[PDB]
Amino acid sequence: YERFVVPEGTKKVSYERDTKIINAASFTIEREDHTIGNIVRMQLHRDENVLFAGYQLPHPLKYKIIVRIHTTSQSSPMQAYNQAINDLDKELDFLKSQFEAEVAKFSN
């Protein structure tokens, strides 16, 4: 119904460049929960040039995430954000490969 995926007239992800601090932005993601925000922030903490990775829900009844990234120079929020998403996608590839391998050892 309307609780699920974002209707027409609103983006899925809305970017916002923070004003008062250099190397700082706030990614306001629609239609999510702790599932994606948690794995995104814990992938961000394994990076070198990142400084601050968190998410919070502006009301616990409403179904959206706001993520914040403070980074150093030699990078940006955009670079480390897309680095996080792509490396999580690669790990899900390698995990699906391992699981479909291990299913085959129940050989029928």
**Alpha carbons 5 and 96: distance in angstroms, whole number:** 26
Q: How many CB atoms lie under 10 A from the CB of residue 93?
A: 10
Our finding on whether 72 is near another protein (CB under 8 A) is no
- In angstroms, give the least distance from the CB of 20 to another protein: 20
Binding mask 4-43 for another protein (x = CB under 8 A): x-------xx-x-----------x-x--xxxxx-xx--xx
How far, in Å, are 91, 95, 108 from residue 105 at the CA level? Answer: 22, 16, 9
Tokens of 89: 């996608």
Binding residues for another protein, rule: CB under 8 A, are 1, 3-4, 12-13, 15, 27, 29, 32-36, 38-39, 42-43, 46-48, 78, 81-83, 85, 87-96, 98-103, 105-106
